[PDB]
Amino acid sequence: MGSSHHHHHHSSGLVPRGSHMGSDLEDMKKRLKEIEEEAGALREMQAKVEKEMGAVQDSSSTSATQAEKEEVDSRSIYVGNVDYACTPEEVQQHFQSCGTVNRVTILTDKFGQPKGFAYVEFVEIDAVQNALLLNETELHGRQLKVSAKRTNIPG
User: Fold this and answer.
1) Which residues form the RRM domain (predicted)?
2) Which residues contact 130 (CB under 8 A, 6 or more apart)?
3) Contact 103, 72 (CB under 8 A)
């Protein structure tokens, strides 16, 4: 109730963001930082947003791994039953034919399960949509299982 009569709003077709980036963090002992770091404190540099907004590809790039990641982690696919002699590159570039890949993590099983377990993620939904649709068929001469990695709570 409340609404009078639902209508229709034609959506505009945007262009895909074909880009691959991301900084990796290595866990180790902290050192004496001599250089400045990206720490926003009480400073009148808030007006610098006009320039920083255009440098978000370098400066506010880590913000994507926190905010945009919420889309990327839910726009990924899980690859199981992979070839024991498979490589991450051949996997991510193979599925790239259906959807672009921004990041991919592979893990070698040593419990007796098929190694090559990996998952690719991207920002564009259209990319993963084609991936989850057409993926598992033949990889390295083996057949794997690909499922949508739609991470979320059980509700």
Assistant:
1) 75-151
2) 98, 99
3) yes
